[PDB]
Amino acid sequence: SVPSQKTYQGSYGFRLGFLHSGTAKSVTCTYSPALNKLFCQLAKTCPVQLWVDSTPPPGTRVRAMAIYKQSQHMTEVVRRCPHHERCSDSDGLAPPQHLIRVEGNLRAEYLDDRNTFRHSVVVPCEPPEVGSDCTTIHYNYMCYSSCMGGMNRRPILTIITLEDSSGNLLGRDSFEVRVCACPGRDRRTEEENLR
Ligand SMILES: CNCc1ccc2c(c1)c1ccccc1n2CCF
Ligand SMILES: [Zn+2]
């Protein structure tokens, strides 16, 4: 009915990482550690790092799913709004209803859950390239937080799960997301409000 959001490093020490992009007016994606919140523009690249302490088995996958943050909305499926689901911006793989896409990975799979109706996108867990210490997934968020008939100004969380080949839980992390026109200004405002 509601997916768990409990942080769980599991046997492999799984956790996320984010770049340090700053808050200039021109920034298109920026992460606030103090808020555990990603601020991004519509349909722009959001780099999310995956870190582990030890190598998970072949066939491990990484899934992303959005849920509403507020308890009174958590049972409602997060989906694109009535405008964006019809705007013919398909990448040829993501269903037009899905808020979260993975960019540039032909092995991405998109799930409409047959029981919960929730959307998710899952990719194989790949090791870092030679010379790198982590792997990065590039996500896109395909509606604004403010879209009427969709998120409608309600905050969302993204839950990232590390899964075995059967879909069993190996690790979990999460972060709040705001999709907005000016991520740098909004991050500065919300960090000031918190302080
Ligand atoms: C020093 N570098 C550690 C590190 C960081 C991230 C890593 C790995 C190793 C690793 C090894 C095998 C398969 C996937 C792997 N990931 C991605 C999932 F977090
Ligand atoms: Zn929309």
UniProtKB/Swiss-Prot annotation:
Listed result of changing V122E: In sporadic cancers; somatic mutation
Region annotation Interaction with CCAR2: where it falls in the sequence: 1-195
UniProt effect for mutating Q9L: In a sporadic cancer; somatic mutation
Mutagenesis or variant effect for E163Q: In sporadic cancers; somatic mutation
Result after altering I100T: In sporadic cancers; somatic mutation
UniProt effect for mutating V78E: In sporadic cancers; somatic mutation
Effect of substituting S21F: In a sporadic cancer; somatic mutation
Name of this chain's protein: Cellular tumor antigen p53
